[PDB]
Amino acid sequence: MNKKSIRDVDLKGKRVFCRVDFNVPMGKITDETRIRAALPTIQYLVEQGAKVILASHLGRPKGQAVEELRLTPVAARLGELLGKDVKKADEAFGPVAQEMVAAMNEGDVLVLENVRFYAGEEKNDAELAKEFAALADIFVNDAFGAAHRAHASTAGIADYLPAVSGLLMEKELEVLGKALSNPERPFAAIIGGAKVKDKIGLIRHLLDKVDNLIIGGGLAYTFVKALGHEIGLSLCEDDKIELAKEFMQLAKEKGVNFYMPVDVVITEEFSETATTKIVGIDSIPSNWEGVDIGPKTREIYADVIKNSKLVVWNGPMGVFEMTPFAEGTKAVGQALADAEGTYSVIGGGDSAAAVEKFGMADKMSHISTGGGASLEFMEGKELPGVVCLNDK
Ligand SMILES: [Cl-]
Ligand SMILES: [Cl-]
Ligand SMILES: [Cl-]
Ligand SMILES: [Cl-]
Ligand SMILES: [Cl-]
Ligand SMILES: [Mg+2]
To answer: Do 205 and 176 contact (CB within 8 A), yes or no?
Structure first.
């Protein structure tokens, strides 16, 4: 894969429909980072003298104009950050959007209304896609995190216009694309979180790619059970036991080094003030539950991370917002930070939340903001908002 970006096209004077992620948590805006993330792209376009027309979702209006999910305050904040009079349209298509576009000069920025106000957005209605296209000369997709769904502003519009990546999307495709096609090696994936179900596709696909597979989080206790170890009260998806067995068999047959917990932090009651102890993985008491990877396992996982040249991390080692269950996730973050020979890729939202929380985000090589998109990409899916981009 090799997609054109805004670096590869003549933009001066062009109306650019630029799909961004301004889905900020809200009364007023309470986290700004998504708007900041978008700045290099917007600025690059402004410097080239493009007419920058920004489209984003915000919250869940489910196909009608809800008044508290308008993009008006996001446009106000963007204006502050750019030091520019950013204009904002209360419709994202039709005559009002059209006229505000007609009124633009080169280097102007116009934020269109929340694309999710319109039922046809989620349905990828062709007529709405054509209406969005009527506003522009070129489609720039800078919202990797929205690109896994076929929506009018993420994919449909590319039926009518040329289509290229923005700066965030370009980097996401460079890093994740290389990880699937020609990773540095050894290549480890760390797969965690609470549920096997959520990570089935990723486990399956990355067992064809990695040298090392490391599991943790509540997901791992299904694997522990599948080996015939006792798991007490730990989370287990009984209908995924046989899948887990087959995954371990695939790893063995392929010579993938398969790392699961060798020791576990256990408790009788999940809570922020929980009483815990550490036990070996074949010694989980019948009335306790596994809640984190133990220190022996943290040491092993750190060694594997330090000896892997590419590590993709999707999912924590425990419910790390709970103080007593955070150390395994902290240790994995620290090992990635400490590993001077390792390209660290944070592949999902909860792993991203963890590295921000524990202070090492700055030291990660790439933190994906694709969310459900980054997972789908790493499962080897064709993302509608990526496929539609024009080939270099
Ligand atoms: Cl790589
Ligand atoms: Cl399978
Ligand atoms: Cl978990
Ligand atoms: Cl093989
Ligand atoms: Cl994650
Ligand atoms: Mg480093």
So the answer is: no
Distance 190 CA to ligand 5 centre (A): 10
The one-letter code for the residue type at 359 is G
Which of 178, 195, 245, 309 is the catalytic position? 195
CB 359 within 8 A of CB 337: no
Cα(1)–Cα(243) distance, integer angstroms = 31
From the CA of 205, the nearest ligand is 2
A 10 A CB-CB count for 233 gives 19
- Alpha carbon 192 to its chain centroid, in Å, reads 15
Using DSSP, state whether 100 is helix, strand or coil: helix
* Token pair for 208: 């064809």
Give CA–CA dist 160/101, Å, rounded: 18
User: Other C-beta atoms within 10 Å of 209: how many?
Assistant: 17
Query: DSSP code of 310?
Result: E
Resolution in A: 1.7
Residue ranges covered by each domain of the chain: 2-168, 175-379
Alpha-carbon distance of 311 to 221, in angstroms, equals: 22
- Name the region of 178 (left: φ>0; alpha: ψ -120 to 50; beta: rest): alpha
Angle at 347 between CA 74 and CA 327, to 5 degrees: 105
Q: Is 83 annotated as a binding residue?
A: no
Residue in 131, 41, 130, 49 with CA at minimum distance from that of residue 94:
131
Is residue 347 annotated as a catalytic residue, yes or no?
A: no
Cβ neighbour number for residue 306 with a 10 Å cutoff:
15
CATH topology identical between 2-168 and 175-379? yes
Pairing of β 51-55 and β 87-88: unpaired
For the domain with range 175-379, which CATH number is right: 3.40.30.10, 3.10.560.10, 3.30.70.240, 3.40.50.1260?
3.40.50.1260
- Which amino acid is present at 293? I
Q: What dotted CATH number matches 2-168?
A: 3.40.50.1260
Print burial letters for 13-23: b (CB count within 10 Å at least 16), e (below 16): ebbbbbbbbbb
